[PDB]
Design an enzyme around this catalytic site. Structure first.
Site, PDB file in Angstrom:
ATOM      1  N   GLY A 228      71.137  32.063  44.370  1.00  0.00           N
ATOM      2  CA  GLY A 228      70.989  30.666  43.981  1.00  0.00           C
ATOM      3  C   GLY A 228      69.611  30.113  44.340  1.00  0.00           C
ATOM      4  O   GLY A 228      68.738  30.864  44.778  1.00  0.00           O
ATOM      5  N   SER A 229      69.429  28.794  44.177  1.00  0.00           N
ATOM      6  CA  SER A 229      68.105  28.181  44.239  1.00  0.00           C
ATOM      7  C   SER A 229      67.698  27.816  45.672  1.00  0.00           C
ATOM      8  O   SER A 229      66.615  27.258  45.866  1.00  0.00           O
ATOM      9  CB  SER A 229      68.006  26.995  43.270  1.00  0.00           C
ATOM     10  OG  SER A 229      69.140  26.130  43.323  1.00  0.00           O
TER      11      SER A 229
ATOM     12  N   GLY B  62      77.694  27.793  46.803  1.00  0.00           N
ATOM     13  CA  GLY B  62      77.062  26.618  47.383  1.00  0.00           C
ATOM     14  C   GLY B  62      77.079  26.600  48.913  1.00  0.00           C
ATOM     15  O   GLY B  62      76.576  25.648  49.500  1.00  0.00           O
TER      16      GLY B  62
ATOM     17  N   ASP C  86      68.599  31.910  40.108  1.00  0.00           N
ATOM     18  CA  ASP C  86      68.794  30.611  39.497  1.00  0.00           C
ATOM     19  C   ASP C  86      67.489  29.831  39.598  1.00  0.00           C
ATOM     20  O   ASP C  86      66.880  29.794  40.668  1.00  0.00           O
ATOM     21  CB  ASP C  86      69.871  29.808  40.212  1.00  0.00           C
ATOM     22  CG  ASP C  86      71.303  30.307  40.110  1.00  0.00           C
ATOM     23  OD1 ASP C  86      71.571  31.275  39.369  1.00  0.00           O
ATOM     24  OD2 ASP C  86      72.141  29.723  40.793  1.00  0.00           O
TER      25      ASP C  86
ATOM     26  N   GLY D 227      77.135  33.223  47.722  1.00  0.00           N
ATOM     27  CA  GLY D 227      76.948  33.121  49.154  1.00  0.00           C
ATOM     28  C   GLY D 227      75.892  34.077  49.692  1.00  0.00           C
ATOM     29  O   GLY D 227      75.660  34.085  50.901  1.00  0.00           O
TER      30      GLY D 227
ATOM     31  N   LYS E 190      74.603  28.862  31.651  1.00  0.00           N
ATOM     32  CA  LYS E 190      76.009  28.635  31.935  1.00  0.00           C
ATOM     33  C   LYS E 190      76.650  27.777  30.841  1.00  0.00           C
ATOM     34  O   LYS E 190      76.051  26.811  30.370  1.00  0.00           O
ATOM     35  CB  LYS E 190      76.109  27.995  33.324  1.00  0.00           C
ATOM     36  CG  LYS E 190      75.785  28.924  34.505  1.00  0.00           C
ATOM     37  CD  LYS E 190      75.813  28.264  35.889  1.00  0.00           C
ATOM     38  CE  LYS E 190      75.412  29.159  37.035  1.00  0.00           C
ATOM     39  NZ  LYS E 190      76.333  30.286  37.250  1.00  0.00           N
TER      40      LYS E 190
END
EC number: 4.3.3.6
Lengths: 269, 269, 268, 270, 268
Positions: free
Chosen positions: E231-232, E149, E20, E210, E77
């Site tokens: 993720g970022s 998240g 991401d 995760g 997305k």
């Protein structure tokens, strides 16, 4: 009848966007951007209830200011069941009254008898039964209730899909079974049978509640609505003339992705 | 319209008594005693269900025998929702069909579409909403459901008081409140408004279920019914010509106590 | 009887507006604006309960000051069941006592026996049964309870529609069924039958609780009330002489939209 | 495919009546009355369960006797899930097998895999989802479950209205919404989409359970069935040749009231 | 068919990591580190919902900036059920659309009909039934929903084990019992039978939600995934080129502990 005259008036709005405005400046940006009408509002009811207050008819003075600033039709909100608020709005000489669940309810059990008025009414609905009840009371135009103030499209999609879905069921249904269907909807049989013959709602159907982006507005049109209402969030952003124009463009060119890219590009928040 | 013609046919029964019969002999006693019509029945459904059996349309042959024995109109029962039983009864050439809850139900969700037939229908009801639903489906004549087979008048009184009571409420009601009232009854608004203007039911209203004595029959007339149905219990007693005549006399002279004493006197079991 | 005398006194108020006031100045603006009476109040009970306090009779001194400032009738509130507060209000020489649910309750089970007094009483109600019970106790005038302190008209509409609706049912009802109807309302049969013959409540019926705008006031009159009560919100705005006059005008010209536009315009 | 061959065979039954029989005499009355097929049954399962017994496949001997007495097709019942009962019925050389809920269930969780057989199967259903599940398993013909043995038509009407009603809903439905609809029916999507295009069930649909009178049979045809099953109650009344013929006549002339009067007249007791 | 073309496109990603990114700089670090694709995101939806906001399609402008910065495929997305957001993403000319539960839902009852588009879609799943439903709607690639998240791998492990476990059950199952199994999964029978013959999912299956460390990424590969999304969080630490490279290295050398020690060492 004078009912079909009112229905006819509301049909001229087909294909349009209606914008909420709180002053004459906003009203002018809206008209310039190509809105088919404006909705006068002294304060957004979101923010009066946020503070826990009662939300009522707007001051007739500020409605008169908006009526003079523009040449497009002007609408205003009355509390549900408050037939005297409506009498006042008619006497001011506006074009449409919205009997609105976004204002504080005045009568828990009864809506306004809308047949007693010369100008047309808008009412909200969540499903086909509710829509037909509002029409029999004399609404000339229907919108979704959606979910006002959140920018979330979910409730509006639910309502459109619900109404359109039941109409499709009804269109093809064994005639002998329509009596029981009318009972379960708690709706007048005669309007149910008429909706079956037309194959659509006897009045214009707009989307409302949570439309925030060009994509939102175009989705509503692709799902079969006749037009869209949009709140004053449009005026909280950077070039509100640009955001207003964008939504009009989206509704007009709702089935052209290339157009939708152009109007969506660099719009900010 | 042909609807108001059917309504008109049923009106000529006003003031009369209708008797259930199982053969031509019974039919003749009924006619002689002054019944305005007979209801043909091969077996009493009380006694078929007593044995746990299904109760259906009577054999068309025995209906034809009764139709020939008498010159007064002849009615017969069809199961609720069984529109082919009704087609057969129409083709035999009887005068009225009773879509009857006393026979075994055929369709749990739908009644017969009674507008598709040339002869008039009777339906039962427990309250005003149910009555108006049956009328919109095309019933030309309404009776109370009462409680068949018991000789107990209590259910019939509840139903008459219920229907008449709601009509009185409706007659004086603020017109603006009728929309919600129609919703709560689950009845077509247009028939509700029509019932309000007439100040009575748009069709003849008879009492049925549990009428056993001259006093019972007269009570129903004093409560505002247009006539009464009576079951075959009158043929299970002594001199059934006497018991039959007594009930006719009672309905005719329903507000003369002296007459009611005379016909009630020495009536036996 | 002295009861029908009290009923007669309350009828002089038909067609009028009654305003809550906290001082003689407010009382004078009210009189000048064309209020048919004032309701004396040392503090709004909204704001004493807001602080969690008990709300009682006002100091007789400030009531006397208001009684002297004006020539229209003066009303005051007593706690429900507090018959000695009422005796004091009678002895001061005011014109009407309001046995008021807006003050803190004094007796959970019994209202004041209002027949033991010379001056007329107002009581609140939510439905026809409650109204008839208050009348039999000796209320000469009825108002809706509504919902005090909110500016929301919804409870008042519910109450008016309820009372008027039951009276319409009663008017047309089979006489033989009235016995059971009286039982279900828990109301005295004799007052039920009298309400049936009149075709309306035997006393004046005013609207109260949440009337905030000219439109609110006119709505209550169009629904069939005889008059309206209005709280001290009127005096929290600019030119309160204008807002007061507007509501009087609205009740007087309640079926004239053109008038209602004029008085509603630029009010805030 | 051999599936569409089986579907094709079952079309010849459209417009017909199928009668339950317990012997060759009954089978002959049925054929003479104009039944399009017979259903062989050594005892009515109503009456074996009445005595609290298990109801199974009939003795192959009495099935063979019936097969020889008549020239119309012969059907027989297998218990649900009992694939060996079915193998036996196939080897006898009958025409159709009915995997029947009127017999005692043999497998609580699984039906017969009907694709593993050369002859066509009938299955029962109460709704559209159940029907499509039976078809995917390889049923070539569907009937209502109704409620066997009572002479009460109400359950059969519920089931017909349910199936036909959902087909009508499906025909007009937004294509994008069909995925969720298939999920809720727990039915194979591909058969759902096919039912949408045809605008009817991909196989013949008969009514069964509680049909007692000519009027009953005609009602089922007017509601949109392709034919009717009828139990052996026909043979417990007077002149059973007359009652049998009457029901055939009713199905043949289902939209002629005048005809229905004639066949219904003086039929005696059911 | 064009469906098998889309399935084929998604297979080129097998063995890779997808990152991401919120800008062109991040996109370039990702490409340099050896990511097989990037996922464009104007803001992390974690943090828009943290503030209680609605999370929608990203501005097409910032997507175009990322598309120009790199030569690897770019994904974005769309909200579930928002088929017009998807039309816009298609018209911009990106490579893959993710119909994402991390954005705010637009249709509570219906997903996008993904067969009406030319470019391939990713969908999430928690179990085999959900995966097969998404595929029949036209998803060309599946990921676990996991738990976005949190940096917690537990939900992702549950989902992988669930899907893989049911496929193993299905592979060996009596054919006669598959009808009932399809009913219980609420999945199309024909896709169930196809999954039985392949002995694996008919499309690529990635892990998502995760994955925080090299060990996390390697675990997912050892459990049988075809690749992973990340993720970022990678860009919130020091030398994010190092942390990015580490995860790529881990997925590439997922069964070499010695390698995993080296890349995990001194990462923070």
């Amino acid at each position: 009848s004078p009912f079909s005259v009112k229905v006819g008036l509301a049909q001229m709005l087909r294909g349009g966007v209606i914008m909420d405005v709180v002053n004459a400046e906003q009203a002018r940006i809206a008209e310039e951007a190509g809105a088919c009408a404006v909705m006068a509002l002294e304060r957004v009811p979101a923010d009066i209830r946020a503070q826990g207050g009662v939300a009522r008819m707007s001051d007739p003075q500020m409605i008169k200011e908006i009526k003079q600033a523009v040449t497009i039709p002007v609408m205003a909100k009355a509390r549900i069941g408050h037939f005297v608020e409506a009498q006042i709005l008619e006497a001011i000489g506006i074009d449409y009254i919205d009997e609105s669940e976004v204002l504080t309810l005045a009568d828990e059990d009864h809506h306004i008898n809308k047949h007693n008025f010369r100008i047309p009414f808008v009412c909200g609905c969540r499903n086909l039964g509710e829509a037909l009840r509002r029409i029999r009371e004399g609404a000339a135009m229907i919108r979704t209730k959606g979910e006002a103030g959140t920018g979330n499209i979910i409730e509006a999609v639910r309502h459109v899909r619900s109404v359109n879905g039941d109409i499709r069921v009804l269109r093809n249904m064994d005639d002998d079974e329509v009596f029981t269907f009318a009972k379960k909807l708690a709706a007048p049989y005669d309007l149910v049978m008429q909706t079956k013959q037309l194959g659509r709602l006897p009045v214009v159907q707009f989307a409302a509640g949570g439309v925030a982006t060009p994509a939102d507005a175009a989705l509503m049109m692709q799902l079969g609505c006749d037009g869209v209402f949009v709140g004053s969030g449009i005026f909280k952003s950077g070039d509100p003339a640009r955001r207003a124009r964008a939504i009009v463009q989206a509704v007009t060119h709702y089935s052209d992705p290339e157009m939708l890219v152009e109007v969506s590009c660099g719009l900010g928040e």
